[PDB]
């Protein structure tokens, strides 16, 4: 009883929770993303970016964190305008300009964020008068060298994604770019879900290579608990989040490293960690990194 497993596990627990978080938010099948964002956001050139086929919580959360981190590197004034509760059913100009202070920075970046991730409400809910006021604000910032705008639209919706696209193309000189989220095959999806629960911290530890061998093993064994759970992720809506939530629970619930391995081998099932237990908010975002 001289050596306490509880002390070692606390360190592992916290490291596993951090990596699971990181893995979830990394859109590994889209490696081009981080380079794309630094190019377009960390410049004084105005830009409109459409994020099409944003079908998963992990994609939205992942893109958002990546955007949030890229703008954190920008040392000039960054203004954030959330367009959502404005366009749905010169006050805009004056609100944007109130935030523009030439005493704290000569150059400024206005980041307009619009999120339309409910394909159900496909009909144009947006006020045409509020939309033309927005493209007018953009037409003014476009002509102002001192101020750069970064418009980021998140959709899977089309009757909205198209009306914006045509209005922005017709009235502005700034060419927009479309970042298409790739549609994975069931096999590919299965690959990236497995990758999410593989940890790389403390590479030179027998305990980490024991953890990673167990998961690789269980997943090659068709009848193992872990592999049956993964066979369900093939049909359940939102598998990365369901897996994330369940794994977070089995990590946090365990007392020793052995308890954690026991849960992966014998306790992780649809009957024990059910879909119902969690809220799959399509616009959910995880807490920021410390450093």
């Amino acid at each position: 009883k001289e050596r306490v497993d509880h002390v070692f596990y606390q360190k592992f627990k916290s490291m596993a929770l951090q990596e699971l978080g990181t893995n979830y938010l990394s859109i590994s099948y889209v490696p081009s993303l981080s380079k794309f964002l630094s190019k377009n956001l960390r410049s004084m050139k105005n830009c409109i970016v459409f994020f099409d086929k944003v079908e998963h919580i992990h994609q939205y959360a992942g893109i958002d964190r990546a955007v949030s981190e890229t703008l954190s590197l920008v040392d000039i004034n960054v203004v954030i305008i959330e367009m959502n509760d404005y366009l749905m059913k010169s006050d805009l100009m004056m609100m944007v300009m109130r935030k523009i202070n030439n005493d704290e920075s000569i150059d400024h970046i206005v980041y307009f964020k619009f999120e339309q991730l409910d394909k159900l409400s496909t009909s144009t809910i947006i006020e045409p008068s509020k939309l033309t006021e927005f493209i007018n604000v953009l037409s003014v910032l476009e002509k102002s060298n001192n101020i750069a705008f970064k418009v980021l639209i998140y959709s899977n919706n089309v009757s909205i994604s198209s009306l914006l696209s045509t209005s922005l193309k017709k009235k502005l000189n700034t060419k927009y770019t479309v970042f298409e989220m790739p549609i994975l095959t069931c096999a590919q999806e299965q690959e990236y879900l497995k990758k999410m629960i593989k940890f790389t911290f403390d590479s030179g530890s027998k305990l980490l290579q024991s953890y990673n061998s167990l998961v690789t093993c269980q997943l090659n064994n068709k009848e193992s608990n872990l592999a049956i759970f993964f066979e369900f992720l093939k049909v359940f809506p939102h598998p990365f989040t369901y897996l994330f939530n369940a794994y977070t629970e089995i990590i946090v619930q365990s007392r020793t490293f052995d308890e954690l391995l026991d849960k992966i081998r014998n306790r992780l099932t649809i009957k024990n960690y059910p879909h119902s237990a969690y809220n799959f908010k399509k616009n959910q975002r995880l807490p920021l990194k410390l450093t």
Partner: peptide
């Protein structure tokens, strides 16, 4: 962080992804 008293029946998976008790 996470505290021993912060069980899964009281908190959601998001809670366990804060860095510190301070955060």
């Amino acid at each position: 962080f996470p505290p021993k008293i912060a069980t899964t029946d009281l908190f959601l998976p998001l809670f366990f992804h804060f860095g510190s008790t301070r955060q």
